[PDB]
Amino acid sequence: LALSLTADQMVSALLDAEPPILYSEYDPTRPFSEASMMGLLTNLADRELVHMINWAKRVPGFVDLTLHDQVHLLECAWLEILMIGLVWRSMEHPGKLLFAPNLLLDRNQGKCVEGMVEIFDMLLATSSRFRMMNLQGEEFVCLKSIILLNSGVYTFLKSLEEKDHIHRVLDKITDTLIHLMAKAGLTLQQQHQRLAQLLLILSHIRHMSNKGMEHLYSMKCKNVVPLSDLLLEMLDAHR
């Protein structure tokens, strides 16, 4: 079914599948601490994961995979996906990260948590890049779906037409990106250049997820914030 989709149908399917923007439990009267900020981000991320799981099922081609393959891809990509979502929501808020509509943090507040500001800075820079590029919503949902299908595709462990299927869906999403750009009036040259610009950001998003995962692990060890059962299992998947 996924491969029988036209570019427009691919875009309409991805747009419709978009998860809602969740609120945090941020009480603006409560003075921040390292514990409460980590508590807020963890609480938010945990609720977002449930929506992410049901989102992934609506990504064309994803449910064609075995359940074990689905589990692997989400284990690999979950923080990348949270982070690109975060960067996207923050585009029109220079110097701030919109974790939720009621939780807009700047780098100064990031320093509430030891070692987090460096990651805030990288996220802010990615948001800046999106803004400079004038990233469109249609391009964003393509990119987020690319992350889901790509990030774990070389760490699976017979079949392999399952991986070949993933690569064909990936190609269809490339087709879709180019289609969006051609429709926006970009020349062929401009189309390939923008495609490259967008996919190269995914390297930086991988980097931030890697650094983020290490930081998260140090938080679990230091008993700063109790992670949720799901988050614990998603974190343990990287070790």
Partner: peptide, 10 residues
């Protein structure tokens, strides 16, 4: 039968 697996099934 980890949580993610179950939710993917649910």
């Amino acid at each position: 039968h980890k949580i993610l697996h179950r939710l993917l099934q649910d």
